Short mmCIF file of C-alpha atoms and ligand atoms in Angstrom, two decimals:
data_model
loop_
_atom_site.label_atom_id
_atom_site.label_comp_id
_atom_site.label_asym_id
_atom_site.label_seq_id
_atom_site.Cartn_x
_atom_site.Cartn_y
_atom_site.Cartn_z
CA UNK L 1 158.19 -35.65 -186.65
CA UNK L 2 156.82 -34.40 -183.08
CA UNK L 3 153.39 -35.38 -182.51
CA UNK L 4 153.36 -35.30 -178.85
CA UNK L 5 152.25 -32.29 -177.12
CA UNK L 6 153.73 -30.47 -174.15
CA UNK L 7 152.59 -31.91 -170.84
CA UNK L 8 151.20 -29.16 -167.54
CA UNK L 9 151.35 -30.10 -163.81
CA UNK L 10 149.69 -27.95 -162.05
CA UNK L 11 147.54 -28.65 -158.91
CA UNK L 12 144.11 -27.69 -156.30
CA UNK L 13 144.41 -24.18 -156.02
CA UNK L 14 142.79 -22.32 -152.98
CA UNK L 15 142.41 -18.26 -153.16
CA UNK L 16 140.62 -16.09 -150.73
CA UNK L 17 138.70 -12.96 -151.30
CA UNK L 18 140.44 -9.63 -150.57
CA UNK L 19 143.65 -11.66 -150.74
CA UNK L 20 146.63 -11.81 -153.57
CA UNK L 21 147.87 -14.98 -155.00
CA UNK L 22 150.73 -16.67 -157.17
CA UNK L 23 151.00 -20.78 -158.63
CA UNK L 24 153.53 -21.53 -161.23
CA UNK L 25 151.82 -24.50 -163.57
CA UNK L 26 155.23 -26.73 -164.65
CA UNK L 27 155.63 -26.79 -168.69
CA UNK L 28 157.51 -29.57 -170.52
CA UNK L 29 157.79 -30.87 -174.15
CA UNK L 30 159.93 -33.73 -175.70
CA UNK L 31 161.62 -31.10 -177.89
CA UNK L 32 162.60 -29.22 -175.36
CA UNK L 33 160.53 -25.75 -176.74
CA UNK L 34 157.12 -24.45 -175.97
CA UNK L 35 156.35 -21.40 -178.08
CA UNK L 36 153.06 -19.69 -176.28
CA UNK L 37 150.41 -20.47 -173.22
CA UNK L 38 147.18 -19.89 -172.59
CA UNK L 39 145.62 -20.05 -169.68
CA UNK L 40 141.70 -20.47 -170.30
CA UNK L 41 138.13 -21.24 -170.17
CA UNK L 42 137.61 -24.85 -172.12
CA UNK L 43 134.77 -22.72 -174.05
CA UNK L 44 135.05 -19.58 -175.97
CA UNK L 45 133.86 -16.37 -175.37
CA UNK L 46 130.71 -15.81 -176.49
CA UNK L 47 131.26 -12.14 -177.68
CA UNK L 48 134.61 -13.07 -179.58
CA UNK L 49 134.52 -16.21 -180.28
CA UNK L 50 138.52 -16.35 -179.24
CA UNK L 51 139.54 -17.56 -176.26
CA UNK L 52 139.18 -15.91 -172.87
CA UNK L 53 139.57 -16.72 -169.22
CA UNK L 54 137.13 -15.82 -166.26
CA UNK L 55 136.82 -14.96 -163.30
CA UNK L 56 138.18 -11.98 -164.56
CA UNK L 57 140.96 -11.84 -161.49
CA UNK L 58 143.10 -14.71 -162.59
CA UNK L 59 145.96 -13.44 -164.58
CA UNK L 60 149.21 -15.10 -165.87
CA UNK L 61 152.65 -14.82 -167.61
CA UNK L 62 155.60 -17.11 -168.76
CA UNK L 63 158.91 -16.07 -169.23
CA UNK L 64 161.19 -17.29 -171.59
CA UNK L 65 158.77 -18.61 -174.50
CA UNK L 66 159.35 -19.54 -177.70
CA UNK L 67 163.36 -20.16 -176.55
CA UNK L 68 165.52 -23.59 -177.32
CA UNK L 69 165.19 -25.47 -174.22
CA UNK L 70 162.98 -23.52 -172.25
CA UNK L 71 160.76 -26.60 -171.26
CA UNK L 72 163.14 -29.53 -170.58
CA UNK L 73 161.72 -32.76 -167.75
CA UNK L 74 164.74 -31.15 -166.18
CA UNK L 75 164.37 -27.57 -166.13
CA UNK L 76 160.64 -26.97 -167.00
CA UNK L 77 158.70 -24.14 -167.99
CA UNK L 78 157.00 -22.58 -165.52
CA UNK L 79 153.44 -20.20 -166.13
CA UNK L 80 152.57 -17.75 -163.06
CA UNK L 81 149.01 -17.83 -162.23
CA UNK L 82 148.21 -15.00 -160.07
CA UNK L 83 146.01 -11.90 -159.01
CA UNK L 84 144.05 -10.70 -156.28
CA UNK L 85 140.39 -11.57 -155.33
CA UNK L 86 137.77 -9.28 -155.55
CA UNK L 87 136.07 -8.35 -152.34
CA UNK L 88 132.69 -9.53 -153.84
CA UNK L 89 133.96 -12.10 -155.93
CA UNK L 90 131.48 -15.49 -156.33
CA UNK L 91 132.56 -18.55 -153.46
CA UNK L 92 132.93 -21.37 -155.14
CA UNK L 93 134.90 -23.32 -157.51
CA UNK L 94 136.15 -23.77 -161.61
CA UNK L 95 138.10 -25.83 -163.62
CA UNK L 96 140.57 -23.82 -166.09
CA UNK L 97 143.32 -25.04 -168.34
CA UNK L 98 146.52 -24.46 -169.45
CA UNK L 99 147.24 -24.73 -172.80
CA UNK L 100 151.03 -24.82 -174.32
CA UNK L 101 151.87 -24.84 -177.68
CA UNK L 102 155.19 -26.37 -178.56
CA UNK L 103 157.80 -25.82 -181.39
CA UNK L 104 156.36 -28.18 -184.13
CA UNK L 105 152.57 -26.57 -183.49
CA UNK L 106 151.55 -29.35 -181.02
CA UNK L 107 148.69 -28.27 -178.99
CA UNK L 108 147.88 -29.64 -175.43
CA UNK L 109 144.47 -30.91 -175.78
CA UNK L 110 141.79 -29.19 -172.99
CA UNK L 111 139.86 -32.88 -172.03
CA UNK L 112 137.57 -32.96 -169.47
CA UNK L 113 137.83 -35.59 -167.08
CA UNK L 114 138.08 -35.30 -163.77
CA UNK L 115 141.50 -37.63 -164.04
CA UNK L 116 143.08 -34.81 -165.88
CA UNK L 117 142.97 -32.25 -162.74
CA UNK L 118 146.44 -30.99 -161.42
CA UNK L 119 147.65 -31.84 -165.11
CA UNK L 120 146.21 -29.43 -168.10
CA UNK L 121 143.25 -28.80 -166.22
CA UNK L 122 142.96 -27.19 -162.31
CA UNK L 123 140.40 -26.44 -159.93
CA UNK L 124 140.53 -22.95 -158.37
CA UNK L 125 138.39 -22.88 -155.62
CA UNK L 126 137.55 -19.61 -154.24
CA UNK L 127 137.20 -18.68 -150.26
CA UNK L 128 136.06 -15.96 -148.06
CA UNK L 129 138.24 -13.90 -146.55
CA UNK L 130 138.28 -15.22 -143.02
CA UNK L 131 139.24 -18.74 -143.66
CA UNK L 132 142.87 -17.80 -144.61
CA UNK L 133 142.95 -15.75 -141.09
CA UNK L 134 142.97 -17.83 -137.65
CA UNK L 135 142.94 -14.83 -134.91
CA UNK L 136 145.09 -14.52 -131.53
CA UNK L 137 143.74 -13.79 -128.13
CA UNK L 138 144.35 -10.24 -127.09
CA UNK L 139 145.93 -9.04 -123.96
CA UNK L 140 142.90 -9.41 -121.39
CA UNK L 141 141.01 -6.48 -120.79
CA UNK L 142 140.08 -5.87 -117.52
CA UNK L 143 136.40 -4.11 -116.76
CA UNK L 144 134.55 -3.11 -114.25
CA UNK L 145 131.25 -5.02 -115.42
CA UNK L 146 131.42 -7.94 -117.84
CA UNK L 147 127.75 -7.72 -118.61
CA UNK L 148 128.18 -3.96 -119.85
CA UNK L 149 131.34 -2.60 -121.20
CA UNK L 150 131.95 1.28 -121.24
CA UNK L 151 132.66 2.71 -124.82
CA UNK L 152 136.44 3.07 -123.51
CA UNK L 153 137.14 -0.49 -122.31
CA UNK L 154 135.09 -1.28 -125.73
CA UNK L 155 137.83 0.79 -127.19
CA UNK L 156 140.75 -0.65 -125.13
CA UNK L 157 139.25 -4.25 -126.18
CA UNK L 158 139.93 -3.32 -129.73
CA UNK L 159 143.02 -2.19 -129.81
CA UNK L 160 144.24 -5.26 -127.83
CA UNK L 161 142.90 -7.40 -130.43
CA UNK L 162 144.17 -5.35 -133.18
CA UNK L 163 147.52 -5.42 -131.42
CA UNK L 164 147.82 -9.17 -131.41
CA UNK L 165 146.87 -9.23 -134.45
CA UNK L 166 149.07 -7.76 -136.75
CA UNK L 167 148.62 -10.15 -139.77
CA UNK L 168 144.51 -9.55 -140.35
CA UNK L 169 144.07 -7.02 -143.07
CA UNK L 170 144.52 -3.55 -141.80
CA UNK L 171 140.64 -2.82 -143.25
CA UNK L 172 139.85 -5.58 -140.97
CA UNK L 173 137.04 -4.12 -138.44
CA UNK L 174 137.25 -4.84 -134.72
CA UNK L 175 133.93 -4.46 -132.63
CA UNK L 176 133.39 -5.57 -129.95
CA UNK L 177 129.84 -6.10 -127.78
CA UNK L 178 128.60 -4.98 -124.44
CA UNK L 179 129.90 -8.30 -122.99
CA UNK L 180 133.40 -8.53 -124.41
CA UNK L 181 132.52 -11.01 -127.24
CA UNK L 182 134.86 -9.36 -130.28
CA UNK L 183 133.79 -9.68 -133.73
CA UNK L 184 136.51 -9.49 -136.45
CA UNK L 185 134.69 -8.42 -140.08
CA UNK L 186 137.29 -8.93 -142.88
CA UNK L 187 137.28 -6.41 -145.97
CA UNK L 188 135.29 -8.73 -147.97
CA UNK L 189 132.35 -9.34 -145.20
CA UNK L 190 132.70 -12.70 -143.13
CA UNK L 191 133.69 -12.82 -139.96
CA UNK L 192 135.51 -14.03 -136.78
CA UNK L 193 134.76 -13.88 -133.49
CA UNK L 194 136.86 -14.32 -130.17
CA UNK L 195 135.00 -15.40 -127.46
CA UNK L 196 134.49 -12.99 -123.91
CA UNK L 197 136.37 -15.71 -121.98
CA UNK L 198 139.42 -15.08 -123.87
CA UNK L 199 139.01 -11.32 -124.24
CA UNK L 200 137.63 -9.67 -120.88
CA UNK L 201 138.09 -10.55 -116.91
CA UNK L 202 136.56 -8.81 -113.67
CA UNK L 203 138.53 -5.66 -112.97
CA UNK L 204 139.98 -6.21 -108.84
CA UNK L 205 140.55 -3.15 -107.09
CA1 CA P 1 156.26 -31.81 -178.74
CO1 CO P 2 134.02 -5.61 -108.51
#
């Protein structure tokens, strides 16, 4: 009879606010089958007393369950972990689980331990928005007084930065100061900044 219950790889998981993510958690089970999984909270939820699993952003789906060989040490099963961040979501970190149930109504058992993370149990750790972003020096901008910008060059500044940058979010913000310094605020808040030396020079006649 199969007492053994499916084992999870999964791993340490880094999102960032604003931003959309997908991890596959690997599934497999000595008879080959997994029937369901949940991806959870250890605890219950208070107001149902069924399972649940917060933040509310992370989301996930498994093809293929409940099928003869669907969760082989060859071909395992594979749950997609994925959403997108909210703007103001909480930094930090949590431990979650997945949970697989196999064909003989073997359970994997949520345990924690530290020793079980990147197994079962995985840390999520959540960022802000400018630490998945490293941004590129702009074409220099040449003025005609780098301890006071016009409005224009101010404006030409910008749109440098913004050119040579096509990767930041496109609700990234571009400002820039009345010496050159450019500051780079990402949809969720933090920042960047590119320093004058690499943004503005002396305009030569
Ligand atoms: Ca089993
Ligand atoms: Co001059």
């Amino acid at each position: 009879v199969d007492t053994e219950a499916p084992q999870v790889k999964t791993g340490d998981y880094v999102v960032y606010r604003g931003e959309s993510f997908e991890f596959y958690a690997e599934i497999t089970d000595n008879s080959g089958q997994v029937n369901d999984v949940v991806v959870r909270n250890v605890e219950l939820d208070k107001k149902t007393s069924q399972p649940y699993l917060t933040p509310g952003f992370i989301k996930f789906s498994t093809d293929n369950l409940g099928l003869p060989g669907n969760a082989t040490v060859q071909n395992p099963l594979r749950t997609k972990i994925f959403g997108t961040v909210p703007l103001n979501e909480g930094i930090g970190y949590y431990t979650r689980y997945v949970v697989p149930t196999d064909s003989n109504g073997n359970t994997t058992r949520m345990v924690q331990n530290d020793n079980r993370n990147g197994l079962e149990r995985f840390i999520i750790t959540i960022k802000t928005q400018n630490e998945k972003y490293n941004p590129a020096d702009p074409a220099i901008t040449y003025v005609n007084q780098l301890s006071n910008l016009s409005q224009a060059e101010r404006d030409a500044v910008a749109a440098a930065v913004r050119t040579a940058n096509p990767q930041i979010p496109a609700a990234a913000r571009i400002t820039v100061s009345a010496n050159g310094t450019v500051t780079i605020t990402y949809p969720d808040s933090s920042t960047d900044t590119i320093p004058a030396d690499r943004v503005v020079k002396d305009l030569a006649s």
